Amino acid sequence: APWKAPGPDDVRGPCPMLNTLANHGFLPHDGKNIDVNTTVNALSSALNLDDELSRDLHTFAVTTNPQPNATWFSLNHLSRHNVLEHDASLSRQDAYFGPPDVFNAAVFNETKAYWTGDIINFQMAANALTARLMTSNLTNPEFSMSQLGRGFGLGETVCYVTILGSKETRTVPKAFVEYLFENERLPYELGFKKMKSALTEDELTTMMGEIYSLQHLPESFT
Amino acid sequence: PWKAPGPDDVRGPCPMLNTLANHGFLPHDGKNIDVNTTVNALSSALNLDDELSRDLHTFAVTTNPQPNATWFSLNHLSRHNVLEHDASLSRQDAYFGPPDVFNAAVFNETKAYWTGDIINFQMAANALTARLMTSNLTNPEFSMSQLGRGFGLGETVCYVTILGSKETRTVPKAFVEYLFENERLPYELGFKKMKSALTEDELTTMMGEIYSLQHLPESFTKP
Amino acid sequence: APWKAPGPDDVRGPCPMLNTLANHGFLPHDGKNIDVNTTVNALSSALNLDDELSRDLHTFAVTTNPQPNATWFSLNHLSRHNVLEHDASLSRQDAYFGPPDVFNAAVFNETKAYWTGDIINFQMAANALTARLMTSNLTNPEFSMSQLGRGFGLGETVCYVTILGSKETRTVPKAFVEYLFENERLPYELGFKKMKSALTEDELTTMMGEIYSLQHLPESFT
Amino acid sequence: PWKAPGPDDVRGPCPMLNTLANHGFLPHDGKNIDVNTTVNALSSALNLDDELSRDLHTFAVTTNPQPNATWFSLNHLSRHNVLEHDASLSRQDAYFGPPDVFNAAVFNETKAYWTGDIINFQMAANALTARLMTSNLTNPEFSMSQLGRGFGLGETVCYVTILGSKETRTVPKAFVEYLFENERLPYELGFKKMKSALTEDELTTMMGEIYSLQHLPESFTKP
Ligand code: HEM
Ligand code: HEM
Ligand code: HEM
Ligand code: HEM
Ligand SMILES: [Mg+2]
Ligand SMILES: [Mg+2]
Ligand SMILES: [Mg+2]
Ligand SMILES: [Mg+2]
């Protein structure tokens, strides 16, 4: 598949998947001026997400554009700390410790430890998210996790399992996920093909609850 | 054979010594255990090396309140922050409740990190890491000395390699759940004691291995 | 593929591949009384080795049978230290430290470190063998490595790369090799199919020289 | 710009300081380097944090034979078993030859462990492990104190993360080969100094990471 790394005047953000889609040219390769038609059609073409889900993700995205009531966004808008970006990411530093947009191999090394099989299931995904939340809470004196941010993390975890893998079996090959994060390239060469049955909002919300139910966080946690 | 403990039979915070008492390898009432009793029990039931068993006994007797004692009883082992410590896999922290008896809610956290039918060292490291972070975040009196940290590493190596294989560094998950939940050796699941006795040097090496696979904060207590 | 773990009265040896072939029933599942017809036909059927190579491997094997001039062997005969079995194995302890027949995860952990890619090439294989030789030399006060034993190690390394992988490209997927060693099961479920062009003795000998040329051992080494 | 060293220009065992002298970040003759010169050179050429640069200077001046010196020259750094040590990646052990100049045969061993076009921390750990074992097996005067062991870890973290990325913990192999073989910064290969300055704490953390990926004997010197 066509793919090109970002250059000096291209922008990227904290989302491994949107970065990947820009690298492949499903989104503008420069990462800029992403309109709602582009978002819906890109997420459909690359990943077979349902339009409603894609449109709602776009609606979230444009809240990071500093222009009031904007209808578009750019990938670097997404990076601003504690808007959509949050602490306890799986592959990025907390803003307190470093720029929270770029891939960090040490953070990802922690996450990967909890993927203790060739196939990632929801318990493993829940464990990784729990670990990262506890690590941030213990080490970051500016740690914050709002109700919204907690929901964002649940959605992000459901997304890498079920959009790279199977919403039906709630599993994904570990290699697919490592490839996406480490390369910001879709794992086509490992055999990845987009899902046949489009992921809906209702399916995503249901599965977010499932991940939540498998986590083992302190009762006082958000 | 196996017999449940009665109200006069003392037990402690160690799932394995409790189990050995229930089978009569140790005195069934859990009391007055001297070094020959410890060594015979660990050798006969589990084929630990005698040097390791003797050194474990030496640790155990430090929990006896009586000075210059050469023996201990299982309830002595429950004394908080002598050999017993926070972030146990199957017991409550002493701050929250009695730290001797099995606690299903705590064990449910631990089991979540044992992802397959076979537990490996990464899974075991993950469970210990999670329990340490949970205690640190929830217990306002949490303590974990370098000594306690080392104790936890030893305990984790013990359930994997004494119920399982030091050679493959794995154990069937069902063996471990059976020991903790029943305090009975998993004979009926096929368990047979190791052919090659576990030595102190092997245990020490494997403690470092578990440590190396954990993902705790860099500032977190080291063993 | 049919496969069964060994039971109490089955015997196994220090060779991960012969153990595997017994588990699949290409060799007698009990590991006993392996005649030359069985060896040649099993290595052909499972792995497509040339008959001459298989016959010569059998001729080596029977030297471990304590019966003088035996025409057959059993897998546990192979384990006897410093006959065909040698120090600096990739997945077994040196005899000085432990029984040198069974898989050891700590030894294999060292070996695997040198397979620094998803595809193992000859430089990586040479590096792993070099590392294990140096580790044994440094730690084992009874370390021995004869000229024959050194040759045996070269052959063993060429075998896991080119019999699980490709003699043509001199590479093998790392996952195939890890699967064979850790499971003593052929990596069929990962996509393994035996080579189309049978491996010959001449090819093996040539490639043994290639591995040798890529190693970085002390000049004083055997 | 870059200028080769002449016969009056002293050089030492550090590929990077030699390189910085060749580019004139350090005095081209390699002499009389004070703390402001060190800090300016490391900041301007490589964007190291100033605290790290100052502490590196403090190490460097211990190699000056003159007591109470606040400066050093590059050849001072070559003094065996002060900061210079055995099992270097690109230099001979002092027992076998001068331990300051680049040695292609030694570097050929090191490069063998850099298996792809990109060097990661496992590859770097492997190269260091191999060189340590080679020196131990071949040099009858081999020495590796805990201090020297730590020095080696720091040097390995430095070529990966100062030429490459501390964020991804990788570097292009060609950048590293270019620095060692030419003692010239690999500008023509696309190298640009890091945007986020490397700190002492980051370096220390990554030294522990390299250590954790090495496969040395359990008895081998620890940092
Ligand atoms: C317009 C659509 C999308 C938007 C606006 C968006 C936005 C974001 C943002 C702002 C973050 C950073 C949160 C943080 O970790 O601090 C993020 C992370 C993430 N996104 Fe997206 N995303 C989109 C689509 C997708 C899709 C389709 C996937 C499918 C795999 C995905 C997977 C992820 C994952 C797994 C993370 C977590 C990264 C980490 O924790 O290191 N995203 N996304
Ligand atoms: C004389 C020998 C022994 C002594 C004195 C001893 C002592 C103890 C003590 C005091 C604890 C409580 C630590 C804590 O979790 O707070 C403990 C826990 C533990 N012991 Fe032992 N033990 C002995 C032998 C064994 C053996 C042979 C095994 C083999 C499986 C074993 C497995 C464990 C495990 C897995 C724990 C952790 C339980 C948990 O975290 O919930 N112990 N032991
Ligand atoms: C009749 C045929 C064979 C015989 C007699 C034989 C014998 C042996 C013996 C005695 C060893 C132990 C050497 C040691 O590591 O100490 C060994 C190891 C080994 N064998 Fe075989 N083998 C045969 C066929 C094969 C085949 C077809 C393969 C193909 C992959 C293979 C792969 C290996 C490997 C990779 C090792 C090294 C194990 C290690 O170092 O941990 N062998 N073999
Ligand atoms: C004032 C700052 C520095 C001082 C005093 C210093 C000192 C030294 C010394 C004495 C050695 C020889 C150790 C040995 O291999 O025996 C050395 C080696 C080394 N230095 Fe530096 N160094 C400095 C800065 C740097 C920087 C900024 C880098 C970044 C790439 C670097 C990279 C290396 C490497 C990779 C080696 C190992 C060479 C080998 O093993 O062949 N150094 N340094
Ligand atoms: Mg974040
Ligand atoms: Mg406790
Ligand atoms: Mg061997
Ligand atoms: Mg040196």
- Got the DSSP string for B30-71? ---B-HHHHHHHHHHHH-B-HHHHHHHHHHHHTTSSSTT-S-
Rounded to the nearest whole angstrom, what is the distance from the C-alpha of residue B217 to the centroid of ligand 4? 29
Work out whether the CA dihedral A86, A88, A93, A94 comes out positive or negative: positive
Calpha distance B22→B11 (Å, rounded): 9
What CA–CA distances, in Å, run from B117 to A128, A188, B120, B174? 19, 30, 10, 7
List the single best residue of A138, A143, A174 to mutate versus B (max B Cβ within 10 A).
A138
Q: Is the CB of A159 under 6 A from ligand 1?
A: yes
Contacts 24+ apart (CB under 8 A), B28-36: B28/B3, B30/B5, B30/B73, B30/B74, B30/B75, B31/B73, B31/B74, B32/B71, B32/B73, B33/B57, B33/B60, B33/B71, B33/B72, B33/B73, B33/B74, B34/B70, B34/B71, B35/B70, B35/B71
What is the best residue among B11, B17, B18 to mutate for testing ligand 2's pocket, by most ligand atoms within 8 Å of CB? B17
Calpha distance A37→A208 (Å, rounded): 26
Token output for A193: 């093909």
Calpha distance C132→C91 (Å, rounded): 10
User: Which residue's alpha carbon is at the smallest distance from atom 6 of ligand 1?
Assistant: A15
**What type of residue is A99?**
P
**What type of residue is A222?**
T
For tokens 């560094």, the residue is B169
Instruction: Count other Cβ atoms within 10 Å, centred on residue B145.
Output: 12
Work out whether the CA dihedral D21, D23, D27, D28 comes out positive or negative: positive
B148 alpha carbon, closest ligand: 2
Calpha distance A12→B99 (Å, rounded): 50
Token output for B48: 């630990």
Calpha distance C127→B191 (Å, rounded): 39
Question: Which residues, in sequence order, are bridge partners of residue B80?
Answer: B84
Instruction: Say if the Cβ atoms of A99 and D196 lie within 8 Å.
Output: yes
**A214 contacts in chain B (CB < 8 Å):** 112
Rounded to the nearest whole angstrom, what is the distance from the C-alpha of residue A13 to the centroid of ligand 1? 9
Question: Which residues, in sequence order, are bridge partners of residue A171?
Answer: A121, A166
Q: Is the CB of A39 under 6 A from ligand 1?
A: yes
Instruction: Find the distance separating the first CA and the last CA of chain B, reported in whole Å.
Output: 38
Residue boundaries of the structural domains of chain A: 16-214
The H-or-E segment that residue A173 falls in is strand A171-173
Contacts 24+ apart (CB under 8 A), A92-99: A92/A14, A94/A136, A94/A140, A94/A142, A94/A143, A95/A142, A96/A140, A96/A141, A96/A142, A96/A143, A97/A140, A98/D167, A98/D196, A99/D196
Last residue before each break in chain D (C–N > 2.5 Å): none
Exposed, middle or buried: residue B95 (CB in 10 Å: 0-12, 13-18, 19+)?
A: middle
What fold is seen in the domain D15-213?
Chloroperoxidase (1.10.489)
B181 alpha carbon, closest ligand: 2
Token output for B135: 């205690």
Calpha distance C59→C36 (Å, rounded): 8
Nearest partner of D11 among D75, D91, D62, D66, judged by Cα = D75
Calpha distance A4→A186 (Å, rounded): 12
Question: Which residues, in sequence order, are bridge partners of residue C173?
Answer: C119
Q: Which 8-state DSSP code applies to residue A198?
A: P
Rounded to the nearest whole angstrom, what is the distance from the C-alpha of residue B196 to the centroid of ligand 7? 18
Nearest partner of D180 among D104, D117, D125, judged by Cα = D104
Nearest partner of B39 among B22, B20, B23, judged by Cα = B20
Contacts 24+ apart (CB under 8 A), A28-37: A29/A4, A30/A6, A31/A6, A31/A74, A31/A75, A31/A76, A32/A74, A32/A75, A33/A72, A33/A74, A34/A58, A34/A61, A34/A72, A34/A73, A34/A74, A34/A75, A35/A71, A35/A72, A36/A71, A36/A72
Supply the DSSP string of chain B, one letter for each residue: ------TTS---S-HHHHHHHHTTSS-TT---B-HHHHHHHHHHHH-B-HHHHHHHHHHHHTTSSSTT-S-B-GGGGGSBTTTB-SS-SSS--TTTS-SSS--HHHHHHHHTT--SSEEEHHHHHHHHHHHHHHHHHH-TT----HHHHHHHHHHHHHHHHHHSBTTTTEEEHHHHHHHHHHSS--GGGT----SSPBPHHHHHHHHHHHHHH----TTS---
Cβ atoms of A163 and A187 within 8 Å: the answer is no
Asked: is C16-214 a CATH 1.20.120.80 domain? The reply is: no
Contacts of A18 (CB under 8 A, 6+ apart): A27, A75, A78
For tokens 């064979």, the residue is C180
Cβ < 6 Å from ligand 4: which residues? Answer: D 13-17, 38, 42, 46, 56-57, 59-60, 77, 83-85, 88-91, 155, 158-159, 162-163
Token output for D30: 């390699």
Among chain C residues, the shortest Cα distance to B121 is held by C105
For tokens 């210990």, the residue is B128
Calpha distance B16→B110 (Å, rounded): 17
What CA–CA distances, in Å, run from B147 to B61, B81, B85, B143, D81? 17, 10, 10, 11, 35
**B208 contacts in chain D (CB < 8 Å):** 218
CA atoms within 13 A on the CB side of C221: 22
Work out whether the CA dihedral A148, A153, A156, A161 comes out positive or negative: negative
Query: Apex CA C164: angle with CA C159 and CA C169, to 5°?
Result: 85
The H-or-E segment that residue A121 falls in is strand A119-121
Rounded to the nearest whole angstrom, what is the distance from the C-alpha of residue A156 to the centroid of ligand 7? 48
Contacts of D39 (CB under 8 A, 6+ apart): D50, D53, D54, D57
Cβ atoms of B169 and B121 within 8 Å: the answer is yes
Calpha distance A131→B134 (Å, rounded): 10
Among chain B residues, the shortest Cα distance to D208 is held by B218
Cβ atoms of B90 and B107 within 8 Å: the answer is yes
- Experimentally, the structure was elucidated by X-ray
Nearest partner of C177 among C48, C65, C90, judged by Cα = C90
What CA–CA distances, in Å, run from D121 to A3, D4, D109, D161? 26, 31, 17, 10
Calpha distance B74→C189 (Å, rounded): 50
Calpha distance C20→C46 (Å, rounded): 10
Calpha distance A134→A128 (Å, rounded): 10
Dihedral in degrees, nearest 10, Cα atoms D3, D5, D8, D13: 140
**What type of residue is D215?**
H
Calpha distance C94→C88 (Å, rounded): 6
Q: Which chains touch C (3 or more CB pairs under 8 A)?
A: B, D
List the single best residue of A92, A96, A101, A102 to mutate versus D (max D Cβ within 10 A).
A102
Phi-psi region of D81 (alpha: psi -120 to 50; beta: other; left: phi over 0): left
Give the 3-state secondary structure percentages of chain A, helix then strand then coil, rounded to 5: 50, 5, 45
Collapsing DSSP to helix, strand or coil, A20 comes out as helix
Nearest partner of A65 among A54, A76, A57, A55, judged by Cα = A76
Contacts of C92 (CB under 8 A, 6+ apart): C14, C100, C101, C102, C103, C104, C107
Collapsing DSSP to helix, strand or coil, A14 comes out as coil
Do you know the residue count of chain D? 223
Calpha distance C8→B179 (Å, rounded): 24
By Cβ distance, the residue of C117, C137, C139 closest to D116 is C117
Nearest partner of B5 among A107, B20, A183, judged by Cα = B20
Rounded to the nearest whole angstrom, what is the distance from the C-alpha of residue D85 to the centroid of ligand 8? 4
Cβ atoms of B185 and B19 within 8 Å: the answer is yes
Contacts of B5 (CB under 8 A, 6+ apart): B11, B18, B21, B22, B28, B30
Among chain C residues, the shortest Cα distance to B205 is held by C106
Among chain B residues, the shortest Cα distance to A136 is held by B217
For tokens 């730690």, the residue is C139
Cβ atoms of A145 and B137 within 8 Å: the answer is no
B91/chain C closest Cα distance in angstroms: 30
Q: Which 8-state DSSP code applies to residue A84?
A: T
Question: Which residues, in sequence order, are bridge partners of residue A121?
Answer: A171
Calpha distance C120→A19 (Å, rounded): 30
By Cβ distance, the residue of B168, B196, B205 closest to C105 is B168
Any C CB within 8 A of D122 CB: yes
Q: What are phi and psi of B142, to 5 degrees?
A: -50, 130
Work out whether the CA dihedral A195, A199, A203, A205 comes out positive or negative: positive
Closest approach atom of ligand 2 to CA B59: 5
Q: Which residues surround ligand 8, an ion (CB under 5 A)?
A: D 84, 88, 91, 99
Nearest partner of A162 among A121, A217, A215, judged by Cα = A121
Instruction: Say if the Cβ atoms of A104 and D167 lie within 8 Å.
Output: yes
What CA–CA distances, in Å, run from D77 to D4, D55, D74, D82? 19, 15, 6, 8
Instruction: Count other Cβ atoms within 10 Å, centred on residue B83.
Output: 22
CA atoms within 13 A on the CB side of A212: 16
For tokens 């195939």, the residue is C176
Cβ atoms of D175 and D186 within 8 Å: the answer is yes
What CA–CA distances, in Å, run from D76 to B220, D58, D60, D63, D184? 39, 13, 8, 5, 21
Instruction: Say if the Cβ atoms of D169 and A105 lie within 8 Å.
Output: yes
B-contacting residues in D 189-208 (Cβ below 8 Å): 205, 208
Calpha distance C61→C55 (Å, rounded): 10
Nearest partner of D8 among D73, D69, D83, judged by Cα = D73
Nearest partner of C119 among C157, C174, C195, C192, judged by Cα = C174
**D208 contacts in chain B (CB < 8 Å):** 218
Instruction: Count other Cβ atoms within 10 Å, centred on residue C69.
Output: 7
Token output for C221: 């080494």
For tokens 């050089």, the residue is D11
Nearest partner of A1 among A29, A25, A32, judged by Cα = A25
Collapsing DSSP to helix, strand or coil, A216 comes out as coil
Q: What are phi and psi of B159, to 5 degrees?
A: -70, -30
Q: Are strands C171-173 and A171-173 parallel, antiparallel or unpaired?
A: unpaired
Calpha distance C80→C82 (Å, rounded): 7
Token output for D88: 């270097």
Supply the DSSP string of chain C, one letter for each residue: -------TT----S-HHHHHHHHHTSS-TT---B-HHHHHHHHHHHH-B-HHHHHHHHHHHHTTSSSTT-S-B-GGGGGSBTTTB-SS-SSS--TTTS-SSS--HHHHHHHHHT--SSEEEHHHHHHHHHHHHHHHHHH-TT----HHHHHHHHHHHHHHHHHHSBTTTTEEEHHHHHHHHHHSS--GGGT----SSPBPHHHHHHHHHHHHHH----TT--
Calpha distance C35→C54 (Å, rounded): 12
Nearest partner of B142 among B151, B131, B154, B128, judged by Cα = B131
Q: What does the buried/exposed string (b/e) look like for A181-200 if buried means 16 or more CB atoms within 10 Å of the residue's CB? A: bbbbbbbeeeebebbeebbe
C175 CA to centre of own chain: 16
Question: Which residues, in sequence order, are bridge partners of residue B84?
Answer: B80
What CA–CA distances, in Å, run from D72 to D59, D63, D218? 10, 7, 37
Cβ < 6 Å from ligand 2: which residues? Answer: B 13-17, 38, 42, 46, 56-57, 59-60, 77, 83-85, 88-91, 155, 158-159, 162-163
